[PDB]
Design a protein around this ligand. Structure first.
Ligand SMILES: CCCCCCCC/C=C\CCCCCCCC(=O)O[C@H](COC(=O)CCCCCCCCCCCCCCC)COP(=O)(O)OC[C@@H](O)CO
Ligand SMILES: Cc1ccc(-n2nccn2)c(C(=O)N2CCN(c3nc4cc(Cl)ccc4o3)CC[C@H]2C)c1
Ligand SMILES: CCCCCCCCS[C@@H]1O[C@H](CO)[C@@H](O)[C@H](O)[C@H]1O
Ligand SMILES: CCCCCCCCS[C@@H]1O[C@H](CO)[C@@H](O)[C@H](O)[C@H]1O
Ligand SMILES: CCCCCCCCS[C@@H]1O[C@H](CO)[C@@H](O)[C@H](O)[C@H]1O
Ligand SMILES: CCCCCCCCS[C@@H]1O[C@H](CO)[C@@H](O)[C@H](O)[C@H]1O
Ligand SMILES: CCCCCCCCS[C@@H]1O[C@H](CO)[C@@H](O)[C@H](O)[C@H]1O
Ligand SMILES: CCCCCCCCS[C@@H]1O[C@H](CO)[C@@H](O)[C@H](O)[C@H]1O
Ligand SMILES: CCCCCCCCS[C@@H]1O[C@H](CO)[C@@H](O)[C@H](O)[C@H]1O
Ligand SMILES: CCCCCCCCS[C@@H]1O[C@H](CO)[C@@H](O)[C@H](O)[C@H]1O
Ligand SMILES: CCCCCCCCS[C@@H]1O[C@H](CO)[C@@H](O)[C@H](O)[C@H]1O
Ligand SMILES: CCCCCCCCS[C@@H]1O[C@H](CO)[C@@H](O)[C@H](O)[C@H]1O
Ligand code: NA
Length: 300
């Protein structure tokens, strides 16, 4: 099982790095690709490259070795960077939904520009880097056998140190609602209103109006799949974290092999999301597909 786990993580690492580099290059090299949505998709690729490059290898060895092998400093930094990546991804997806919902359902309120999208992107990172400092603060690295700590990192564990039973419950309830439930629930409702608008009806609309709607239907369909795939990828880890930290589950030693398997798969699934997003754009965006086809007809 350990080598299938290695092969799964390695496939995702390679596909996510190549795929997300291609997303950044496509938007950067082509003016026709520089849409508000594509600026936010590049930001989602930056969040996903942060998780793929630094957090994915750490999670693979923790899942295999069942120990922390990166020292005390990295015990704070790597969990922090993973929390930052999720906050960036989910706020990026939220801002795309917000942009599309305003552009489509309430067209005359706010202006949707690339410069305003870059302003939002900076704000997303500023917020995410700050709100995830409590995660870095609670991370502690400790040996199960303190006398072996000098000799080896084999019995070293990276985990959250909580001074009371109440604080982890409030924190993990807030983490779930802020980074998963409230933005996805709101995004689901936004896309349902976008769907009703784009796939309904108004006579006497111009050539530029009719063409923009056809283009919008194609993009909205793609974004709905990205949001649904994100909701599915992050659902097992969210459920497991809430069950473990809010409801005090999985503390029995008899269940440890089934618990580790469930968390190992759930951590992998989060990383599979970074590999999924460029694959979704390839199949649901003709603009990205054309770019990827040109990249692979050149590189290979
Ligand atoms: C930290 C997060 C911040 C980032 C979040 C930003 C990202 C979000 C992007 C865009 C937001 C646009 C939201 C658009 C909201 C659309 C809301 C809405 O009206 O949806 C209706 C269904 O919901 C309803 O009945 C209401 C039912 C509510 C469902 C309750 C489940 C909770 C899910 C979680 C909710 C969290 C809310 C937190 C508030 C702060 C169907 O509509 P419809 O046209 O038929 O007419 C309405 C009526 O006449 C029919 O009941
Ligand atoms: C490995 C991994 C992947 C995704 C996760 N996720 N859950 C919700 C959203 N995303 C988590 C997780 O359970 N998180 C996020 C941050 N945390 C974390 N611990 C990490 C350990 C390693 Cl080796 C690498 C990254 C790590 O991120 C601990 C607190 C908790 C909230 C852990
Ligand atoms: C953005 C990152 C900023 C945090 C500072 C990181 C400095 C490297 S620490 C160093 O890294 C190795 C990696 O394998 C471990 O083996 C060592 O034991 C550990 O001491
Ligand atoms: C100015 C408010 S527009 C208003 O926005 C709602 C939000 O959902 C729609 O449901 C309604 O039909 C529509 O009147
Ligand atoms: C953008 C604002 C900067 C975010 C900084 C937090 C990132 C985790 S690094 C970690 O921070 C600890 C706080 O718990 C310090 O004790 C250590 O020096 C260091 O290892
Ligand atoms: C490594 C350092 C781990 C941080 S412990 C942290 O200490 C605070 C004050 O003791 C409490 O507010 C919290 O509940 C608890 O998480
Ligand atoms: C921000 C939302 C935080 C709500 C999380 C509360 C955790 C639900 S379990 C609950 O926790 C109580 C407090 O520790 C205990 O008295 C009970 O025995 C136990 O059933
Ligand atoms: C904020 C993140 C935590 C939210 C989790 C929602 C589920 C809690 S309801 C749960 O359901 C049981 C029956 O199944 C009942 O005995 C109790 O009333 C209660 O413990
Ligand atoms: C795309 C909608 C995501 C909403 C997240 C709630 C999990 C649904 S569990 C039924
Ligand atoms: C999305 C994540 C939310 C998952 C739903 C949580 C519902 C679990 S019921 C709740 O949990 C514990 C045992 O399961 C006990 O401590 C409580 O007495 C019981 O009432
Ligand atoms: C798949 C996840 C493996 C968890 S096993 C599970 O652990 C719970 C924690 O308390 C118990 O309620 C049950 O007895 C048992 O079935
Ligand atoms: C490729 C197919 C391999 C899938 C492996 C599935 C293993 C199921 S273990 C089973 O899971 C339940 C979850 O509901 C828990 O209640 C139990 O404690 C636990 O024993
Ligand atoms: Na992601």
């Amino acid at each position: 099982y350990a080598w299938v786990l290695i092969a799964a993580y390695v496939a995702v690492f390679v596909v996510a790095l190549v795929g997300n580099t291609l997303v950044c290059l496509a938007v950067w090299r082509n003016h026709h690709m520089r849409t508000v949505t594509n600026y936010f998709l590049v930001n989602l690729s930056l969040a996903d490259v942060l998780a793929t490059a630094i957090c994915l290898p750490a999670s693979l060895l923790v899942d295999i070795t069942e120990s922390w092998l990166f020292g005390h400093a990295l015990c704070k930094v790597i969990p922090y960077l993973q929390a930052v990546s999720v906050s960036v991804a989910v706020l990026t997806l939220s801002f795309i939904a917000l942009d599309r919902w305003y552009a489509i359902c309430h067209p005359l309120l706010f202006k949707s520009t690339a410069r305003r999208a870059l302003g939002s992107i900076l704000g997303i990172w500023a917020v995410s880097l700050a709100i995830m400092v409590p995660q870095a603060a609670v991370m502690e690295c400790s040996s199960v056998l303190p006398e072996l700590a000098a000799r080896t990192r084999a019995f070293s564990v990276c985990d959250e140190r909580w001074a009371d039973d109440l604080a982890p419950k409030i924190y993990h309830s807030c983490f779930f609602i802020v980074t998963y439930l409230a933005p996805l629930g709101l995004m689901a409702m936004a896309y349902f209103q976008i769907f009703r608008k784009l796939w309904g009806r108004i006579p006497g609309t111009t050539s530029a109006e009719v063409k923009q709607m056809r283009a919008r239907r194609k993009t909205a369909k793609m974004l709905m799949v990205v949001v649904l795939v994100f909701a599915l990828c992050y659902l097992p880890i969210s459920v497991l974290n809430v069950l473990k930290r809010v409801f005090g589950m999985f503390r029995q030693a008899s269940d440890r092999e089934a618990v580790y398997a469930a968390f190992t798969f759930s951590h992998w699934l989060v990383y599979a999301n970074s590999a999924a997003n460029p694959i979704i754009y390839n199949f649901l965006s003709g603009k990205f597909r054309e770019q990827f086809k040109a990249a692979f007809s050149w590189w290979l």
